[PDB]
Amino acid sequence: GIPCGESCVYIPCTVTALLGCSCKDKVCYKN
């Protein structure tokens, strides 16, 4: 639910992927 900022527009999130953020609504959120 926490917006990690980085979004998955064209490619998957890479920096927030390290934070444990998931691609949801094309934005990466962590819970």
From Swiss-Prot:
Which keywords does this Swiss-Prot/TrEMBL entry list? Disulfide bond, Knottin, Plant defense
Q: How is it modified after translation?
A: Contains 3 disulfide bonds.
InterPro entries, A to Z: Cyclotide, Cyclotide_bracelet_CS, Cyclotide_sf
Annotated crosslink Cyclopeptide (Gly-Asn) location: 1-31
Q: Name one GO biological process term.
A: defense response
Does the record bear Transcription regulation in its keywords? no
Q: Which cysteines are joined by disulfide bonds?
A: 4-21, 8-23, 13-28
* Tissue expression per record: Expressed in seed, root and nodule but not in flower, stem, shoot, leaf and pod (at protein level).
**Pfam families the UniProt entry points to:** Cyclotide
> What is its biological role?
Probably participates in a plant defense mechanism.
Q: What is known of its domains?
A: The presence of a 'disulfide through disulfide knot' structurally defines this protein as a knottin.
Protein family (similarity comment):
Belongs to the cyclotide family. Bracelet subfamily.
Annotated protein name in UniProt: Cliotide T10
